[PDB]
Amino acid sequence: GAGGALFVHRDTPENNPDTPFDFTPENYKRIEAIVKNYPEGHKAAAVLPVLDLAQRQNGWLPISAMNKVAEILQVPPMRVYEVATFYTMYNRKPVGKYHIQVCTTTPCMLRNSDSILEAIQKKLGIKVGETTPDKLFTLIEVECLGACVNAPMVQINDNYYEDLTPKDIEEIIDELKAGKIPKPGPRSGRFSCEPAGGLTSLTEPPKGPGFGVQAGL
Amino acid sequence: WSSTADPLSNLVLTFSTKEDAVAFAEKNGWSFDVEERKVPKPKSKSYGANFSWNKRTRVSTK
Amino acid sequence: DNSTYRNLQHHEYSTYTFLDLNVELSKFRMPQPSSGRQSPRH
Amino acid sequence: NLIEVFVDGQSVMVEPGTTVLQACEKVGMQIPRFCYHERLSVAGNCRMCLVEIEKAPKVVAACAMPVMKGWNILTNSEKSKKAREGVMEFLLANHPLDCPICDQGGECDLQDQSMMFGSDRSRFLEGKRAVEDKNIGPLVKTIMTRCIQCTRCIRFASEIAGVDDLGTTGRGNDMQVGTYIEKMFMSELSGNIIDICPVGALTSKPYAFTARPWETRKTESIDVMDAVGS
Amino acid sequence: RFRGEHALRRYPSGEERCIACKLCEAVCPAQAITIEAEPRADGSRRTTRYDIDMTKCIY
Amino acid sequence: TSFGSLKDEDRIFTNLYGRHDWRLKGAQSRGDWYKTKEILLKGPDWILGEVKTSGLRGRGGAGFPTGLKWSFMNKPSDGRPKYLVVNADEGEPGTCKDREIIRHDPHKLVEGCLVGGRAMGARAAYIYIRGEFYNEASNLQVAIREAYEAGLIGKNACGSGYDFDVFVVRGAGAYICGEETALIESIEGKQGKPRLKPPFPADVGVFGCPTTVANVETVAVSPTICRRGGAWFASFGRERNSGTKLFNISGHVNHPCTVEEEMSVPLKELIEKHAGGVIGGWDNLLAVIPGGSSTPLIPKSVCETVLMDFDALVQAQTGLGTAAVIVMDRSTDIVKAIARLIEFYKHESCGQCTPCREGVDWMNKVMARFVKGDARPAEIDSLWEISKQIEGHTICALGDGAAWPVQGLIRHFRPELEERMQQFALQHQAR
Ligand SMILES: Cc1cc2nc3c(=O)[nH]c(=O)nc-3n(C[C@H](O)[C@H](O)[C@H](O)COP(=O)(O)O)c2cc1C
Ligand code: SF4
Ligand code: SF4
Ligand code: SF4
Ligand code: SF4
Ligand code: FES
């Protein structure tokens, strides 16, 4: 499966070193809070959190944003470029307002993840790597998202919508485009990873402090 | 084409030892210049030095 | 009562919740160790 | 004090911290390598230098594994030969068929080590990988389909020349070496990346297509462009 | 299979096939081939001199 | 002897399923944060001995003695800081247990971090949590704030005189950064490519200081082992396979879920009891992957009588791994499922070293041709050989784990591959 995204930069009017980007004062406070989580003389350890903060502020990572992060942390811009191109959660290209990521790995594929993907494609009228004309939705496929037992599932801006059906995902998309924020979590009546039929364990109240404490401890 | 008038332009001889080479040159009468063999000096290599806590050997990339 | 989902506080988080919590935690930390130099390139 | 190690059963005293590659060098055996350069740091990613220790179930990276007391290093063992054949098979599986149009030609480490340590046949029945060529100035010509991602140029750039404008972007089989931007790697020590690149990815642009290594005659002289006397 | 007078071929588009790789010069038993090359105007690897001494060639 | 039927009074991970309060008040309502000061005053050697007697093994893939690893880090200080890195990059397909532990038992995780830091003499604990788990990371940060305010962690932790910090580091998307040395590299703000061994992380870790990387489940079960015994933990399970385990049953099953059971519960009983069995019944079972993508698959014949245990699964040419049980019923494309797993490994390969990089791409192409029959029966053995060439010749274990599913498919379902190739040959020759 071809990724479709290049790892080289061509200067454009919308993406060039002269594109204006600079952190807000609040984000500078957050940067100075992040920086002192690491030993002095190892400021380069903050590249990932600072780059993620820049992406959260700007919506994506322009080359000017990468250069700004490199300047703030006094690390080589090539090192920042390496990190940005290595990690897939960093958007080096503009995305939509809502970034749907459909998990397509085997545990989610055994359940009807293809139905979820097809329903999203028909509902939005876009392909699997395109963006809606109104710059509102972007759709991609991703690998395991850590919610395998709640398959199939999608992630839309760090929210997990699990136990999906085509009807449920269409309702979620409608709620998103209307303006409301759907409640993340399973859509099948479960609350979490518990079995659907009923609790096969942890049915009785938990034991209190000091239940089976060792004699000496 | 490239011409020549020197019979010994392509002549290269192989010897196992400097003493053997010098003996051959002396008995055949040619003048000779001897260059001592250069061997690389032993070098201390360590993979763990790439991640030094306080030294400058720490690498910024892999 | 063992029939209600008590992990409902996460339907309020925003973009900067994690980093704001990190800023709040800055007070409770302890001084970081130093390598003796400002950067590996120094 | 020196510790005693064995290479093919032959004893040799080496200082602690000496690598398997250097112990074999001391006994006179040159282990195949691609990413190891003695003037640069140890990377250990091409995996061409794997050797077998006599009792170890797993082959070790000779360029990065320090020797322990009483190790027997089986340089020409069946496991070592198979490891070299596998690594060379992967490299030549993705390499392009550019030998006649390649300036590296008859002085290529991939060719020589393929002829000495690899197989004589190909099992790759798929399509190859083609990589866009970068531009880093008027001196070095980059044809990056021939790169084997050994990261010699990166380590040399940073460590030796103090210039950190080379690196790897992306990951997986699509990993690329370059600047990620239109930047020229201009420095007083640039052609040494032409020398250290084991393949024809980095080649001299003024010397392009002019000659082949077997034709040329080598004259050992010194340099007069400066007072160092190289 | 007959080996007679030599010839340099072209692609059906008219481009010369030779790429100045000097394999023929390397393998020639009698050293009858002299090849000199340089990048062309369009950047191709092409020969500027390609000589065969037919009095030195052993066919 | 029989194993399983674990009791709720013995299940370590209470508040699983999130039916109770996950705050400090709720955690203290259960046994968490109880006599932690007394454990710390008992000190490092006592904690290490208790862990060694309990015989706990690594819960995040390769199962090594955690007592042995922590003793490795118990060397005297040499003027450098000491770090415990808790791995929470739950990237292995099929695995959700770490997510559940972080989201519902964050105070258990934090207490385990404090106990492990005391055991190893560590000043700080970095919890490296994957970037997708944003809400889980936020819950973890809230729990850390509550612990700091209550004075449980920080300076003079639990009123014991031990100074201990707990930082949370959110990674980006990298199944490779799930690895321990890649974890260390990514914490240092680098690409996240695994290092070579030696130097071992217990000798040169993050920032070049001694560090110990431990799984979330391991560190979370550490304080319960300390408060309780470890003769008890050894009693639960087999002789060299002790304690409880979190199993994530998913796939073609009626009630996919995450549950806690003993360390030697038979696979068939676990599936029939905690998951409702296969959708078409047990006779409709085709294959089971018992440890996520890395471990090979086993057919119904092996799954009929097999114990969900390290050694029991190793003897079946498999592994326990992360105890992620993926079930595939008879009405599935096993070749396509394995091809999808190989494509996953192709996307998540870090690309540092030649065998894994080139060979995993090559195996992805070969499998993609296999699923449609566009191959020859002589290519099955070629695929086996290239998979054997990847395994053991890589820097890290991702290359080894990318060859085992291929080997399992070739070993158990070669007739399917040959039949598909023959069918394709007949279909194309009819043109
Ligand atoms: C969540 C998680 C993800 C892991 N992912 C990988 C991986 O992608 N590749 C790998 O070789 N090892 C992986 N490992 C194993 C680690 O290299 C290492 O063995 C483990 O983190 C140590 O924890 P333990 O002592 O509890 O077993 C993973 C471990 C955990 C906990
Ligand atoms: S780099 Fe070597 S193997 Fe590759 S095309 Fe050039 S001469 Fe051939
Ligand atoms: S360009 Fe050459 S020196 Fe640089 S990584 Fe590629 S093969 Fe190695
Ligand atoms: S140099 Fe000789 S062998 Fe090479 S392409 Fe030209 S004619 Fe053919
Ligand atoms: S085996 Fe693969 S993931 Fe591991 S270091 Fe090598 S290239 Fe990276
Ligand atoms: S396979 Fe989809 S969440 Fe894991």
Ligand code: FES
């Ligand atoms: S020379 Fe050792 S792995 Fe490359």
Ligand SMILES: [Mg+2]
């Ligand atoms: Mg070169």
